[PDB]
Amino acid sequence: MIYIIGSGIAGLSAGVALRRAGKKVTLISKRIDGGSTPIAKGGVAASVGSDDSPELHAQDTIRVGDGLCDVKTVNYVTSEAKNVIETFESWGFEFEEDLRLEGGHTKRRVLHRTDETGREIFNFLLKLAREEGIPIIEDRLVEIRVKDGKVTGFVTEKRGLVEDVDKLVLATGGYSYLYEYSSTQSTNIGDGMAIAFKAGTILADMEFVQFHPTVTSLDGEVFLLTETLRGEGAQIINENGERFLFNYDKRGELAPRDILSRAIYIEMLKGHKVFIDLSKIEDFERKFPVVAKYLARHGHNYKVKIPIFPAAHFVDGGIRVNIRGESNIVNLYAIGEVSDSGLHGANRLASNSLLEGLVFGINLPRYVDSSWEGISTDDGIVHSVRISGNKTLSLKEIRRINWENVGIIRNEEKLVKAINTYSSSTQNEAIISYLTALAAEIRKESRGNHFREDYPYKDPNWEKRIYFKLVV
Ligand SMILES: Cc1cc2nc3c(=O)[nH]c(=O)nc-3n(C[C@H](O)[C@H](O)[C@H](O)COP(=O)(O)OP(=O)(O)OC[C@H]3O[C@@H](n4cnc5c(N)ncnc54)[C@H](O)[C@@H]3O)c2cc1C
Numbered sequence: 182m183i184y185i186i187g188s189g190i191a192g193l194s195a196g197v198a199l200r201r202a203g204k205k206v207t208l209i210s211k212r213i214d215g216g217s218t219p220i221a222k223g224g225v226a227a228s229v230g231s232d233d234s235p236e237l238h239a240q241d242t243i244r245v246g247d248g249l250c251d252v253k254t255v256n257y258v259t260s261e262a263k264n265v266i267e268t269f270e271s272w273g274f275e276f277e278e279d280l281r282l283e284g285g286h287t288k289r290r291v292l293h294r295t296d297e298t299g300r301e302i303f304n305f306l307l308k309l310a311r312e313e314g315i316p317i318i319e320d321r322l323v324e325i326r327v328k329d330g331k332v333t334g335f336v337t338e339k340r341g342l343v344e345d346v347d348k349l350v351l352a353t354g355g356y357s358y359l360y361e362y363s364s365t366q367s368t369n370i371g372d373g374m375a376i377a378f379k380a381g382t383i384l385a386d387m388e389f390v391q392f393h394p395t396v397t398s399l400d401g402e403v404f405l406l407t408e409t410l411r412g413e414g415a416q417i418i419n420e421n422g423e424r425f426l427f428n429y430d431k432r433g434e435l436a437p438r439d440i441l442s443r444a445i446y447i448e449m450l451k452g453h454k455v456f457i458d459l460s461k462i463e464d465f466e467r468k469f470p471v472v473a474k475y476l477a478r479h480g481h482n483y484k485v486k487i488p489i490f491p492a493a494h495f496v497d498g499g500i501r502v503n504i505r506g507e508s509n510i511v512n513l514y515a516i517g518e519v520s521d522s523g524l525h526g527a528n529r530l531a532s533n534s535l536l537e538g539l540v541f542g543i544n545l546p547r548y549v550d551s552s553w554e555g556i557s558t559d560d561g562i563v564h565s566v567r568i569s570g571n572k573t574l575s576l577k578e579i580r581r582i583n584w585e586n587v588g589i590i591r592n593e594e595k596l597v598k599a600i601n602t603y604s605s606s607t608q609n610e611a612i613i614s615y616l617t618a619l620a621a622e623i624r625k626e627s628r629g630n631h632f633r634e635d636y637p638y639k640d641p642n643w644e645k646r647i648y649f650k651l652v653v
Pocket residue numbers: 186187188189190191192209210211212213214215216217218219220221222223224225226299320321322323352353354355364365366368369372373405494495516517518519531532533534535536538
């Protein structure tokens with residue numbers, strides 16, 4: 182029996198694919214509709230345009246990757262995109278013909294289906310899993326059993342010890358919810374990632390957490406405000422109405438995502454409240470139908486300033502894996518956001534994440550019947566860490582500490598505070614937060630979404646990963 186933990190695009194597509202490959206599969210997820218997949222409102226990258234190509238897509242990916250992208254993985258994912266999309270469509274899913282554009286991409290290559298592509302993909306995959314007879318169980322993974330560096334079983338909250346496992350596919354997503362300001366659901370605390378770590382699984386790139394510059398949460402509904410708004414005339418000001426951005430970068434509202442994130446971050450740290458003003462955008466309703474709808478249902482006049490905030494959005498790292506999704510632990514796969522295939526390097530390229538999940542999931546059957554290859558750490562430095570203690574922190578405290586001391590702008594003093602706070606804890610949320618801070622402190626430079634005011638430049642000597650391994 183093959184077990185898949187997580188019911189997002191990664192876990193679901195793998196489940197359907199494995200089932201079709203004749204495998205007996207069981208899906209287990211703490212919240213069937215949890216994770217980031219259901220609420221993704223953008224699209225899936227694929228160089229299928231007449232003016233595009235896998236190589237160009239690869240070049241764009243490598244660029245934002247800022248030197249940390251695993252070139253082999255990038256080439257594999259971009260070269261697979263077309264046939265994976267085609268396979269997915271043969272299953273009965275149809276993307277729209279119009280390819281959208283996203284910042285960072287040289288050509289239009291983003292596939293969409295309605296204004297809620299993630300939701301559509303989710304429901305579709307869930308419908309197929311049901312028709313394939315795949316059991317979908319709502320339970321929570323809490324432990325993984327390993328012998329001689331191989332998976333033998335695992336434990337769930339509700340059913341306890343599971344001993345009949347030939348393969349365990351972890352598709353539990355990232356830990357962006359471990360930040361006071363997050364764009365995802367509360368399920369994303371990275372416990373799946375921590376549990377794997379406790380079973381001897383190797384983690385990497387924990388310090389490369391990606392933040393989104395302009396997010397809002399009217400009535401509690403999170404909504405990413407596209408950078409295209411600023412391109413059409415959107416303004417950003419504090420509670421006083423001044424366009425502070427100009428004081429950090431001359432490009433103002435037109436500066437890179439990370440730039441605004443840093444400017445906004447500092448401003449808020451002073452206690453200022455930030456807003457975005459869309460009243461000067463011409464033909465707003467025609468240009469931004471989805472934004473208009475979001476604002477309409479919350480009874481917020483798009484002519485009035487909107488409270489915004491930067492937020493933890495996507496984590497580049499996690500369980501290191503090769504192109505197949507194999508971690509260092511035999512029979513333990515990691516796919517989707519919980520894994521670190523090296524596709525994203527120091528900064529994920531928009532739309533490459535749903536693509537990543539779909540590729541590793543749909544392509545998984547191609548490798549399940551082969552001998553295990555595993556991973557190589559020759560592209561980085563392995564750090565062995567021992568977790569021991571009984572200090573316990575609330576989720577709210579952890580999220581505030583990460584936001585302030587392991588956030589958009591970092592430095593040694595703050596990182597050390599975070600390190601010392603989590604040092605004596607064995608809580609999953611604490612461990613993940615600990616490794617992120619530890620790695621951020623070790624990486625004495627600024628690269629991709631990792632920015633240190635005390636080391637503002639990129640160190641060519643750091644063009645390598647920071648791997649973590651648990652020891653007694
Ligand atoms: C608001 C938002 C919009 C986004 N939009 C896009 C986009 O437009 N295009 C793009 O490419 N990327 C986008 N991203 C990322 C993207 O949506 C992908 O879904 C994501 O990167 C990962 O998908 P996944 O299957 O790996 O995990 P998820 O979809 O996050 O999977 C998490 C699953 O694992 C389960 N789980 C977690 N822990 C446990 C546990 N311990 N036991 C059992 N189950 C567990 C969860 O309940 C959930 O079902 C967006 C992210 C956000 C937050």
